[PDB]
């Protein structure tokens, strides 16, 4: 679920999902168009594609369980949708952590008109 993803993001990065990734660049927190602005935005592009691989799942609301082995995220077995949603969220959280070094506040609340064109998953 979105709320679980937000907690995972905070655990991973130290940043609150809202507002740190809820409106960042062209793909975080909302969009579906344009060239991603930077690595962090690319995390969101890929995460959007990942959810797009799951038509019949409901990532906003469906809850999954996971644990941390040491620092590693281990998705625990639920329904097939839950497992796949968890893997998408895990990847995004890791991706945000891997990019923190180039995260830029200038991309928070990035305006939609600066995001144009289709980028295929």
């Amino acid at each position: 679920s979105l709320l679980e993803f937000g907690k995972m993001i905070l655990e991973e990065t130290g940043k609150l999902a809202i507002p740190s990734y809820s409106s960042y660049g062209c793909y975080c927190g909302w969009g579906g168009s344009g060239t991603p602005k930077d690595a962090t935005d690319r995390c969101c592009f890929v995460h959007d594609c990942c959810y797009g691989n799951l038509p019949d799942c409901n990532p906003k609301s469906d809850r999954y369980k996971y644990k941390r082995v040491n620092g590693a995220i281990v998705c625990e077995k639920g329904t097939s949708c839950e497992n796949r949603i968890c893997e998408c969220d895990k990847a995004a959280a890791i991706c945000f952590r891997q990019n923190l070094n180039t995260y830029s506040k200038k991309y928070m609340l990035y305006p939609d008109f600066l995001c144009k064109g289709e980028l295929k998953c």
């Binding site: 979105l2 709320l3 993803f5 937000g6 999902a17 975080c28 927190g29 909302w30 959007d48």
Partner: peptide, 5 residues
Amino acid sequence: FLSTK
């Protein structure tokens, strides 16, 4: 309490 598309 919502936040991410």
